[PDB]
Amino acid sequence: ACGLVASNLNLKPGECLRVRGEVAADAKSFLLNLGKDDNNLCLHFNPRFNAHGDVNTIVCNSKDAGAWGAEQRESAFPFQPGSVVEVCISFNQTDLTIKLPDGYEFKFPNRLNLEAINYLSAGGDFKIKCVAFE
Amino acid sequence: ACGLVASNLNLKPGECLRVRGEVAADAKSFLLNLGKDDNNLCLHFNPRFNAHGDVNTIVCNSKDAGAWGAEQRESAFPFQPGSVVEVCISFNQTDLTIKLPDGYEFKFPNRLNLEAINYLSAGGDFKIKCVAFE
Numbered sequence: 001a002c003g004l005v006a007s008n009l010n011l012k013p014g015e016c017l018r019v020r021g022e023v024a025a026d027a028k029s030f031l032l033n034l035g036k037d038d039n040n041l042c043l044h045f046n047p048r049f050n051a052h053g054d055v056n057t058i059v060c061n062s063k064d065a066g067a068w069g070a071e072q073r074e075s076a077f078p079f080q081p082g083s084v085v086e087v088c089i090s091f092n093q094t095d096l097t098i099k100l101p102d103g104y105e106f107k108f109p110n111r112l113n114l115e116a117i118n119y120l121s122a123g124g125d126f127k128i129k130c131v132a133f134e
Numbered sequence: 135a136c137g138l139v140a141s142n143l144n145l146k147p148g149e150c151l152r153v154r155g156e157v158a159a160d161a162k163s164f165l166l167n168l169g170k171d172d173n174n175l176c177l178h179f180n181p182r183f184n185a186h187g188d189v190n191t192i193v194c195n196s197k198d199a200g201a202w203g204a205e206q207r208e209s210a211f212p213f214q215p216g217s218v219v220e221v222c223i224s225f226n227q228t229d230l231t232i233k234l235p236d237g238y239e240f241k242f243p244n245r246l247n248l249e250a251i252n253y254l255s256a257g258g259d260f261k262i263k264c265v266a267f268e
Protein backbone atom coordinates (compact mmCIF):
# COMPACT_ATOMS: atom_id res chain seq x y z
CA ALA A 1 0.00 0.00 0.00
CA CYS A 2 2.60 2.54 1.13
CA GLY A 3 6.27 2.69 2.04
CA LEU A 4 8.48 2.00 5.04
CA VAL A 5 6.91 1.14 8.37
CA ALA A 6 9.10 1.37 11.48
CA SER A 7 8.09 0.66 15.05
CA ASN A 8 9.84 0.39 18.42
CA LEU A 9 11.32 3.84 17.84
CA ASN A 10 12.15 5.26 21.24
CA LEU A 11 11.91 8.91 20.28
CA LYS A 12 11.97 10.82 23.56
CA PRO A 13 11.40 14.62 23.66
CA GLY A 14 14.31 16.74 22.50
CA GLU A 15 15.72 14.05 20.21
CA CYS A 16 15.47 14.73 16.48
CA LEU A 17 14.15 12.46 13.73
CA ARG A 18 15.63 13.26 10.33
CA VAL A 19 14.12 11.70 7.21
CA ARG A 20 15.60 12.12 3.74
CA GLY A 21 14.01 10.75 0.59
CA GLU A 22 13.41 11.50 -3.08
CA VAL A 23 10.01 12.59 -4.33
CA ALA A 24 8.70 11.15 -7.61
CA ALA A 25 9.15 13.17 -10.83
CA ASP A 26 5.35 13.33 -11.11
CA ALA A 27 4.54 13.41 -7.41
CA LYS A 28 0.90 13.98 -6.46
CA SER A 29 1.46 13.67 -2.69
CA PHE A 30 3.53 11.94 0.00
CA LEU A 31 3.24 11.46 3.77
CA LEU A 32 5.07 10.67 6.98
CA ASN A 33 3.00 9.38 9.90
CA LEU A 34 4.48 9.64 13.40
CA GLY A 35 2.87 8.40 16.63
CA LYS A 36 2.18 5.60 19.11
CA ASP A 37 0.76 3.41 16.34
CA ASP A 38 -1.12 3.82 13.06
CA ASN A 39 -4.40 4.76 14.77
CA ASN A 40 -2.86 7.17 17.30
CA LEU A 41 -0.83 9.60 15.22
CA CYS A 42 0.67 12.71 16.77
CA LEU A 43 1.53 13.84 13.27
CA HIS A 44 0.24 13.05 9.85
CA PHE A 45 2.54 15.16 7.61
CA ASN A 46 1.02 15.42 4.14
CA PRO A 47 2.52 17.64 1.37
CA ARG A 48 0.13 17.85 -1.57
CA PHE A 49 1.37 18.93 -4.99
CA ASN A 50 -2.01 18.22 -6.59
CA ALA A 51 -4.31 16.08 -4.42
CA HIS A 52 -7.65 16.12 -2.55
CA GLY A 53 -8.44 19.64 -3.77
CA ASP A 54 -5.11 21.01 -2.49
CA VAL A 55 -2.38 22.23 -4.81
CA ASN A 56 1.14 22.90 -3.48
CA THR A 57 0.03 22.78 0.17
CA ILE A 58 1.27 20.93 3.26
CA VAL A 59 -1.62 19.45 5.21
CA CYS A 60 -1.03 18.31 8.78
CA ASN A 61 -3.49 16.53 11.04
CA SER A 62 -3.53 14.10 13.96
CA LYS A 63 -5.35 10.80 14.56
CA ASP A 64 -6.54 9.73 18.00
CA ALA A 65 -8.10 6.29 18.53
CA GLY A 66 -8.80 6.24 14.80
CA ALA A 67 -10.52 9.62 14.60
CA TRP A 68 -8.92 12.31 12.44
CA GLY A 69 -8.42 15.74 13.98
CA ALA A 70 -8.77 19.29 12.64
CA GLU A 71 -6.53 19.91 9.63
CA GLN A 72 -3.78 22.50 9.57
CA ARG A 73 -2.61 23.75 6.20
CA GLU A 74 0.81 25.36 5.58
CA SER A 75 1.69 27.96 2.91
CA ALA A 76 5.43 27.42 2.36
CA PHE A 77 6.01 24.46 0.04
CA PRO A 78 9.77 23.90 -0.48
CA PHE A 79 9.43 20.62 -2.39
CA GLN A 80 10.07 20.37 -6.12
CA PRO A 81 8.85 17.06 -7.56
CA GLY A 82 11.69 14.84 -8.72
CA SER A 83 14.16 16.03 -6.09
CA VAL A 84 15.70 14.78 -2.85
CA VAL A 85 14.33 16.40 0.30
CA GLU A 86 15.04 16.24 4.01
CA VAL A 87 12.52 16.80 6.80
CA CYS A 88 13.63 17.09 10.43
CA ILE A 89 11.19 16.49 13.28
CA SER A 90 11.39 16.94 17.04
CA PHE A 91 8.82 17.23 19.82
CA ASN A 92 8.15 18.12 23.41
CA GLN A 93 5.29 18.30 25.88
CA THR A 94 3.51 21.15 24.07
CA ASP A 95 4.19 20.55 20.36
CA LEU A 96 6.33 19.27 17.48
CA THR A 97 8.62 21.26 15.19
CA ILE A 98 8.95 20.44 11.52
CA LYS A 99 12.02 21.87 9.83
CA LEU A 100 11.63 21.97 6.07
CA PRO A 101 14.26 23.03 3.53
CA ASP A 102 15.14 26.67 2.74
CA GLY A 103 15.07 27.61 6.41
CA TYR A 104 11.34 27.14 6.83
CA GLU A 105 9.96 25.42 9.91
CA PHE A 106 6.59 25.29 11.64
CA LYS A 107 5.03 23.86 14.76
CA PHE A 108 2.11 21.51 15.30
CA PRO A 109 0.38 20.97 18.66
CA ASN A 110 0.96 17.70 20.48
CA ARG A 111 -2.77 17.00 20.84
CA LEU A 112 -2.04 13.48 22.10
CA ASN A 113 0.40 14.53 24.82
CA LEU A 114 2.73 11.71 23.75
CA GLU A 115 5.93 11.48 25.82
CA ALA A 116 7.58 9.29 23.18
CA ILE A 117 7.14 8.40 19.51
CA ASN A 118 7.38 4.65 18.78
CA TYR A 119 5.89 4.56 15.30
CA LEU A 120 6.59 6.03 11.85
CA SER A 121 5.30 5.10 8.35
CA ALA A 122 5.89 6.63 4.93
CA GLY A 123 3.60 6.74 1.94
CA GLY A 124 2.77 8.32 -1.37
CA ASP A 125 5.11 9.29 -4.18
CA PHE A 126 8.19 9.33 -1.97
CA LYS A 127 11.11 6.94 -1.47
CA ILE A 128 13.03 6.88 1.81
CA LYS A 129 16.79 7.10 1.45
CA CYS A 130 17.76 7.63 5.09
CA VAL A 131 16.29 7.72 8.60
CA ALA A 132 18.47 9.28 11.29
CA PHE A 133 18.15 9.61 15.05
CA GLU A 134 19.66 12.74 16.58
CA ALA B 135 15.38 -9.89 20.99
CA CYS B 136 13.98 -6.96 18.98
CA GLY B 137 14.11 -3.17 19.20
CA LEU B 138 13.70 -1.06 16.07
CA VAL B 139 11.64 -3.13 13.64
CA ALA B 140 11.11 -2.04 10.06
CA SER B 141 8.73 -3.66 7.63
CA ASN B 142 7.84 -3.01 3.99
CA LEU B 143 11.50 -2.35 3.13
CA ASN B 144 11.24 -3.92 -0.33
CA LEU B 145 15.04 -4.10 -0.62
CA LYS B 146 16.21 -5.71 -3.85
CA PRO B 147 19.50 -7.15 -5.21
CA GLY B 148 21.99 -4.40 -5.96
CA GLU B 149 20.59 -2.02 -3.37
CA CYS B 150 22.47 -1.87 -0.09
CA LEU B 151 21.28 -1.43 3.47
CA ARG B 152 23.49 0.68 5.73
CA VAL B 153 23.25 0.93 9.53
CA ARG B 154 25.22 3.09 11.96
CA GLY B 155 24.96 2.91 15.72
CA GLU B 156 26.82 3.05 19.01
CA VAL B 157 27.60 -0.06 21.04
CA ALA B 158 26.93 -0.06 24.80
CA ALA B 159 29.73 0.44 27.36
CA ASP B 160 29.34 -3.05 28.84
CA ALA B 161 27.69 -4.56 25.77
CA LYS B 162 27.44 -8.33 25.91
CA SER B 163 26.10 -8.46 22.33
CA PHE B 164 23.93 -6.89 19.64
CA LEU B 165 22.16 -8.16 16.52
CA LEU B 166 20.67 -7.23 13.17
CA ASN B 167 18.14 -9.49 11.46
CA LEU B 168 17.17 -9.22 7.80
CA GLY B 169 14.52 -11.39 6.16
CA LYS B 170 11.07 -11.80 4.64
CA ASP B 171 9.68 -11.65 8.19
CA ASP B 172 10.40 -12.51 11.86
CA ASN B 173 10.63 -16.26 11.17
CA ASN B 174 12.35 -16.30 7.79
CA LEU B 175 15.65 -14.50 8.19
CA CYS B 176 18.16 -14.57 5.35
CA LEU B 177 20.70 -13.21 7.81
CA HIS B 178 20.93 -13.15 11.59
CA PHE B 179 24.05 -11.03 12.23
CA ASN B 180 25.15 -11.30 15.85
CA PRO B 181 28.45 -9.83 17.23
CA ARG B 182 28.91 -11.29 20.72
CA PHE B 183 31.29 -9.65 23.20
CA ASN B 184 30.39 -12.18 25.92
CA ALA B 185 27.32 -14.31 25.41
CA HIS B 186 26.49 -17.98 24.75
CA GLY B 187 30.02 -19.09 25.62
CA ASP B 188 31.44 -16.83 22.91
CA VAL B 189 33.88 -14.00 23.52
CA ASN B 190 34.36 -11.36 20.82
CA THR B 191 32.98 -13.43 17.93
CA ILE B 192 30.57 -12.61 15.09
CA VAL B 193 28.02 -15.43 14.78
CA CYS B 194 25.92 -15.35 11.60
CA ASN B 195 23.11 -17.75 10.73
CA SER B 196 19.78 -17.95 8.90
CA LYS B 197 16.30 -18.96 10.04
CA ASP B 198 13.77 -20.79 7.89
CA ALA B 199 10.27 -21.10 9.24
CA GLY B 200 11.77 -20.57 12.69
CA ALA B 201 14.51 -23.18 12.34
CA TRP B 202 18.01 -21.84 12.97
CA GLY B 203 20.40 -22.88 10.21
CA ALA B 204 24.08 -23.74 10.48
CA GLU B 205 26.13 -21.12 12.25
CA GLN B 206 29.02 -19.51 10.44
CA ARG B 207 31.56 -17.71 12.63
CA GLU B 208 33.87 -14.86 11.63
CA SER B 209 37.44 -14.03 12.54
CA ALA B 210 37.50 -10.23 12.70
CA PHE B 211 35.70 -8.30 15.43
CA PRO B 212 36.15 -4.54 14.74
CA PHE B 213 33.78 -3.62 17.60
CA GLN B 214 34.70 -1.74 20.77
CA PRO B 215 32.25 -0.92 23.63
CA GLY B 216 31.29 2.75 23.54
CA SER B 217 32.31 3.24 19.90
CA VAL B 218 30.07 3.93 16.91
CA VAL B 219 30.26 1.28 14.22
CA GLU B 220 28.85 1.16 10.73
CA VAL B 221 27.93 -1.94 8.71
CA CYS B 222 26.66 -2.19 5.13
CA ILE B 223 24.79 -5.17 3.68
CA SER B 224 24.13 -5.94 0.01
CA PHE B 225 22.56 -9.00 -1.57
CA ASN B 226 21.66 -10.99 -4.66
CA GLN B 227 20.17 -14.49 -5.10
CA THR B 228 23.49 -16.14 -4.25
CA ASP B 229 24.79 -14.40 -1.12
CA LEU B 230 24.80 -11.32 1.09
CA THR B 231 27.99 -9.29 1.50
CA ILE B 232 28.62 -7.72 4.89
CA LYS B 233 31.06 -4.85 4.41
CA LEU B 234 32.64 -3.88 7.72
CA PRO B 235 34.95 -0.87 8.53
CA ASP B 236 38.38 -0.68 6.85
CA GLY B 237 37.73 -2.57 3.65
CA TYR B 238 37.07 -5.82 5.48
CA GLU B 239 34.04 -7.77 4.31
CA PHE B 240 32.70 -11.32 4.32
CA LYS B 241 29.94 -13.28 2.58
CA PHE B 242 27.03 -15.32 3.90
CA PRO B 243 24.88 -17.46 1.56
CA ASN B 244 21.31 -16.52 0.69
CA ARG B 245 20.12 -19.93 1.86
CA LEU B 246 16.40 -19.12 1.58
CA ASN B 247 16.71 -17.69 -1.94
CA LEU B 248 14.85 -14.49 -1.12
CA GLU B 249 14.65 -12.02 -4.02
CA ALA B 250 13.67 -9.11 -1.80
CA ILE B 251 13.99 -8.20 1.89
CA ASN B 252 10.97 -6.63 3.64
CA TYR B 253 11.94 -7.02 7.25
CA LEU B 254 14.74 -5.54 9.34
CA SER B 255 15.11 -5.90 13.10
CA ALA B 256 17.72 -4.77 15.60
CA GLY B 257 18.40 -5.75 19.19
CA GLY B 258 20.98 -6.09 21.93
CA ASP B 259 23.26 -3.43 23.36
CA PHE B 260 23.24 -1.34 20.20
CA LYS B 261 21.96 2.21 19.60
CA ILE B 262 20.75 2.82 16.04
CA LYS B 263 21.76 6.29 14.89
CA CYS B 264 20.87 5.83 11.23
CA VAL B 265 19.53 3.48 8.52
CA ALA B 266 20.10 4.37 4.88
CA PHE B 267 18.95 2.68 1.69
CA GLU B 268 21.38 2.81 -1.22
Ligand SMILES: CC(=O)N[C@@H]1[C@@H](O)[C@H](O[C@@H]2O[C@H](CO[C@H]3O[C@H](CO)[C@@H](O)[C@H](O)[C@@H]3O[C@@H]3O[C@H](CO)[C@@H](O[C@@H]4O[C@H](CO)[C@H](O)[C@H](O)[C@H]4O)[C@H](O)[C@H]3NC(C)=O)[C@@H](O)[C@H](O[C@H]3O[C@H](CO)[C@@H](O)[C@H](O)[C@@H]3O[C@@H]3O[C@H](CO)[C@@H](O[C@@H]4O[C@H](CO)[C@H](O)[C@H](O)[C@H]4O)[C@H](O)[C@H]3NC(C)=O)[C@@H]2O)[C@@H](CO)O[C@@H]1O
Nearest residue numbers: 135165178180186187188193194195196202203204205206
Ligand atom coordinates in the same frame (compact mmCIF):
# COMPACT_ATOMS: atom_id res chain seq x y z
C1 LIG C 1 33.85 -35.79 23.91
C2 LIG C 1 33.83 -34.51 24.74
O1 LIG C 1 33.64 -34.57 25.96
N1 LIG C 1 33.95 -33.36 24.07
C3 LIG C 1 33.97 -32.09 24.77
C4 LIG C 1 32.62 -31.40 24.56
O2 LIG C 1 31.64 -32.07 25.35
C5 LIG C 1 32.61 -29.89 24.92
O3 LIG C 1 31.41 -29.31 24.34
C6 LIG C 1 31.00 -28.00 24.62
O4 LIG C 1 30.62 -27.94 26.01
C7 LIG C 1 30.17 -26.63 26.38
C8 LIG C 1 30.08 -26.58 27.91
O5 LIG C 1 28.96 -27.37 28.40
C9 LIG C 1 29.09 -27.63 29.77
O6 LIG C 1 27.83 -27.69 30.46
C10 LIG C 1 27.04 -28.88 30.24
C11 LIG C 1 25.82 -28.79 31.15
O7 LIG C 1 25.26 -27.49 31.13
C12 LIG C 1 27.86 -30.14 30.55
O8 LIG C 1 27.09 -31.30 30.28
C13 LIG C 1 29.11 -30.15 29.71
O9 LIG C 1 29.87 -31.31 30.02
C14 LIG C 1 29.92 -28.89 30.01
O10 LIG C 1 30.33 -28.92 31.40
C15 LIG C 1 31.64 -28.60 31.69
O11 LIG C 1 32.39 -29.81 31.66
C16 LIG C 1 33.78 -29.62 31.92
C17 LIG C 1 34.40 -31.00 31.87
O12 LIG C 1 33.60 -31.93 32.59
C18 LIG C 1 34.01 -28.91 33.26
O13 LIG C 1 35.40 -28.53 33.35
C19 LIG C 1 36.25 -29.19 34.22
O14 LIG C 1 35.94 -28.75 35.54
C20 LIG C 1 36.80 -29.29 36.56
C21 LIG C 1 36.28 -28.78 37.90
O15 LIG C 1 34.96 -29.25 38.17
C22 LIG C 1 38.24 -28.87 36.29
O16 LIG C 1 38.36 -27.46 36.40
C23 LIG C 1 38.66 -29.33 34.90
O17 LIG C 1 39.96 -28.87 34.61
C24 LIG C 1 37.69 -28.80 33.86
O18 LIG C 1 38.02 -29.33 32.58
C25 LIG C 1 33.14 -27.64 33.34
O19 LIG C 1 33.25 -27.03 34.62
C26 LIG C 1 31.70 -28.01 33.08
N2 LIG C 1 30.81 -26.87 33.16
C27 LIG C 1 29.52 -27.06 33.42
C28 LIG C 1 28.60 -25.85 33.48
O20 LIG C 1 29.04 -28.18 33.63
C29 LIG C 1 28.87 -26.29 25.66
O21 LIG C 1 28.44 -24.98 26.02
C30 LIG C 1 29.05 -26.37 24.13
O22 LIG C 1 27.73 -26.36 23.52
C31 LIG C 1 27.48 -25.46 22.47
O23 LIG C 1 28.12 -25.88 21.27
C32 LIG C 1 27.70 -27.18 20.79
C33 LIG C 1 28.41 -27.41 19.47
O24 LIG C 1 29.81 -27.19 19.59
C34 LIG C 1 26.17 -27.25 20.65
O25 LIG C 1 25.77 -28.58 20.37
C35 LIG C 1 25.47 -26.77 21.92
O26 LIG C 1 24.06 -26.75 21.71
C36 LIG C 1 25.96 -25.37 22.24
O27 LIG C 1 25.68 -24.51 21.10
C37 LIG C 1 25.17 -23.23 21.31
O28 LIG C 1 23.74 -23.32 21.30
C38 LIG C 1 23.11 -22.03 21.49
C39 LIG C 1 21.61 -22.28 21.51
O29 LIG C 1 21.11 -22.53 20.21
C40 LIG C 1 23.54 -21.04 20.40
O30 LIG C 1 22.99 -19.74 20.68
C41 LIG C 1 21.94 -19.25 19.90
O31 LIG C 1 22.44 -19.02 18.57
C42 LIG C 1 21.47 -18.45 17.68
C43 LIG C 1 22.13 -18.29 16.32
O32 LIG C 1 22.31 -19.54 15.68
C44 LIG C 1 21.00 -17.10 18.22
O33 LIG C 1 22.09 -16.20 18.25
C45 LIG C 1 20.43 -17.27 19.62
O34 LIG C 1 20.10 -16.00 20.16
C46 LIG C 1 21.46 -17.93 20.50
O35 LIG C 1 20.91 -18.15 21.79
C47 LIG C 1 25.06 -20.94 20.37
O36 LIG C 1 25.48 -20.10 19.31
C48 LIG C 1 25.62 -22.33 20.18
N3 LIG C 1 27.06 -22.29 20.09
C49 LIG C 1 27.68 -23.13 19.27
C50 LIG C 1 29.19 -23.06 19.20
O37 LIG C 1 27.06 -23.96 18.59
C51 LIG C 1 29.80 -27.67 23.71
O38 LIG C 1 28.90 -28.76 23.72
C52 LIG C 1 33.88 -29.20 24.34
C53 LIG C 1 34.07 -27.76 24.80
O39 LIG C 1 33.63 -27.56 26.14
O40 LIG C 1 35.08 -29.91 24.75
C54 LIG C 1 35.18 -31.26 24.25
O41 LIG C 1 35.10 -31.17 22.87
Ligand SMILES: CC(=O)N[C@@H]1[C@@H](O)[C@H](O[C@@H]2O[C@H](CO[C@H]3O[C@H](CO)[C@@H](O)[C@H](O)[C@@H]3O[C@@H]3O[C@H](CO)[C@@H](O[C@@H]4O[C@H](CO)[C@H](O)[C@H](O)[C@H]4O)[C@H](O)[C@H]3NC(C)=O)[C@@H](O)[C@H](O[C@H]3O[C@H](CO)[C@@H](O)[C@H](O)[C@@H]3O[C@@H]3O[C@H](CO)[C@@H](O[C@@H]4O[C@H](CO)[C@H](O)[C@H](O)[C@H]4O)[C@H](O)[C@H]3NC(C)=O)[C@@H]2O)[C@@H](CO)O[C@H]1O
Nearest residue numbers: 031044046052053054055059060061062068069070071072
Ligand atom coordinates in the same frame (compact mmCIF):
# COMPACT_ATOMS: atom_id res chain seq x y z
C1 LIG D 1 -8.38 28.40 -6.20
C2 LIG D 1 -8.14 27.12 -5.41
O1 LIG D 1 -7.12 26.45 -5.62
N1 LIG D 1 -9.08 26.75 -4.55
C3 LIG D 1 -8.93 25.54 -3.75
C4 LIG D 1 -10.25 24.76 -3.77
O2 LIG D 1 -10.46 24.22 -5.07
C5 LIG D 1 -10.25 23.63 -2.75
O3 LIG D 1 -11.58 23.08 -2.67
C6 LIG D 1 -11.76 21.76 -3.04
O4 LIG D 1 -12.66 21.75 -4.17
C7 LIG D 1 -12.96 20.40 -4.62
C8 LIG D 1 -13.70 20.49 -5.97
O5 LIG D 1 -15.09 20.90 -5.83
C9 LIG D 1 -15.71 20.94 -7.11
O6 LIG D 1 -15.94 19.64 -7.68
C10 LIG D 1 -17.17 19.00 -7.28
C11 LIG D 1 -17.25 17.69 -8.05
O7 LIG D 1 -17.74 17.89 -9.37
C12 LIG D 1 -18.36 19.92 -7.57
O8 LIG D 1 -19.59 19.27 -7.30
C13 LIG D 1 -18.21 21.16 -6.72
O9 LIG D 1 -19.33 22.02 -6.95
C14 LIG D 1 -16.94 21.85 -7.17
O10 LIG D 1 -17.14 22.25 -8.54
C15 LIG D 1 -16.44 23.35 -8.98
O11 LIG D 1 -17.32 24.46 -8.91
C16 LIG D 1 -16.70 25.68 -9.35
C17 LIG D 1 -17.77 26.75 -9.22
O12 LIG D 1 -18.92 26.40 -9.98
C18 LIG D 1 -16.18 25.53 -10.80
O13 LIG D 1 -15.43 26.70 -11.16
C19 LIG D 1 -16.05 27.64 -11.97
O14 LIG D 1 -16.17 27.08 -13.29
C20 LIG D 1 -16.78 28.00 -14.22
C21 LIG D 1 -16.94 27.27 -15.53
O15 LIG D 1 -17.91 26.23 -15.43
C22 LIG D 1 -15.92 29.25 -14.34
O16 LIG D 1 -14.66 28.91 -14.88
C23 LIG D 1 -15.73 29.90 -12.99
O17 LIG D 1 -14.81 30.97 -13.11
C24 LIG D 1 -15.18 28.89 -12.00
O18 LIG D 1 -15.14 29.46 -10.71
C25 LIG D 1 -15.27 24.32 -10.91
O19 LIG D 1 -14.88 24.12 -12.25
C26 LIG D 1 -16.03 23.12 -10.42
N2 LIG D 1 -15.21 21.93 -10.53
C27 LIG D 1 -15.66 20.87 -11.18
C28 LIG D 1 -14.75 19.66 -11.24
O20 LIG D 1 -16.76 20.85 -11.72
C29 LIG D 1 -13.68 19.63 -3.52
O21 LIG D 1 -13.93 18.30 -3.96
C30 LIG D 1 -12.83 19.60 -2.25
O22 LIG D 1 -13.60 19.02 -1.18
C31 LIG D 1 -12.98 19.00 0.07
O23 LIG D 1 -13.21 20.20 0.82
C32 LIG D 1 -14.59 20.42 1.22
C33 LIG D 1 -14.60 21.68 2.08
O24 LIG D 1 -13.87 22.73 1.47
C34 LIG D 1 -15.13 19.22 1.99
O25 LIG D 1 -16.52 19.40 2.24
C35 LIG D 1 -14.93 17.95 1.19
O26 LIG D 1 -15.37 16.83 1.94
C36 LIG D 1 -13.45 17.79 0.85
O27 LIG D 1 -12.66 17.66 2.05
C37 LIG D 1 -11.50 16.91 1.94
O28 LIG D 1 -11.76 15.62 2.46
C38 LIG D 1 -10.65 14.73 2.29
C39 LIG D 1 -11.09 13.37 2.77
O29 LIG D 1 -12.44 13.12 2.39
C40 LIG D 1 -9.42 15.28 3.03
O30 LIG D 1 -8.28 14.44 2.72
C41 LIG D 1 -7.82 13.58 3.70
O31 LIG D 1 -7.12 14.36 4.68
C42 LIG D 1 -6.55 13.56 5.74
C43 LIG D 1 -5.82 14.52 6.66
O32 LIG D 1 -6.73 15.39 7.31
C44 LIG D 1 -5.58 12.52 5.16
O33 LIG D 1 -4.47 13.17 4.57
C45 LIG D 1 -6.30 11.67 4.12
O34 LIG D 1 -5.40 10.75 3.52
C46 LIG D 1 -6.87 12.58 3.06
O35 LIG D 1 -7.55 11.80 2.09
C47 LIG D 1 -9.13 16.70 2.56
O36 LIG D 1 -8.05 17.25 3.29
C48 LIG D 1 -10.37 17.57 2.71
N3 LIG D 1 -10.11 18.89 2.17
C49 LIG D 1 -10.33 19.99 2.90
C50 LIG D 1 -10.05 21.32 2.24
O37 LIG D 1 -10.74 19.96 4.06
C51 LIG D 1 -12.36 21.01 -1.86
O38 LIG D 1 -13.46 21.75 -1.33
C52 LIG D 1 -9.85 24.18 -1.38
C53 LIG D 1 -9.79 23.11 -0.31
O39 LIG D 1 -8.86 22.09 -0.64
O40 LIG D 1 -8.55 24.78 -1.47
C54 LIG D 1 -8.54 25.93 -2.32
O41 LIG D 1 -7.25 26.45 -2.31
